[PDB]
């Protein structure tokens, strides 16, 4: 009602990679591409809010 609001001017995405030898990054990528093992996470709260 009284105060003003924020005003975005520019947004950028930053991302830092671990500098890893291409010899072993290909191997790690080869493993993670396998069907047997894939990342799996669960919400910490893990609840259905009503």
């Amino acid at each position: 009602v009284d105060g003003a609001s924020v005003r975005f001017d520019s947004v950028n995405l930053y991302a830092t990679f671990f500098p890893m030898a291409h010899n072993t990054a290909s191997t790690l990528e080869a493993m993670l591409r396998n069907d047997t093992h894939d990342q799996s996470f669960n919400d910490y709260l893990s609840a259905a809010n009503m």
Partner: peptide, 27 residues
């Protein structure tokens, strides 16, 4: 094979500790 990636604490690599786990819920 992959022991060459681990820091060496002497003549042996610093490996072990099968704690590749995750269990995080409010419970």
């Amino acid at each position: 094979n992959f022991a060459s990636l681990a820091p060496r604490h002497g003549t042996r690599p610093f490996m072990g500790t099968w704690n590749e786990i995750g269990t995080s819920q409010l419970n």
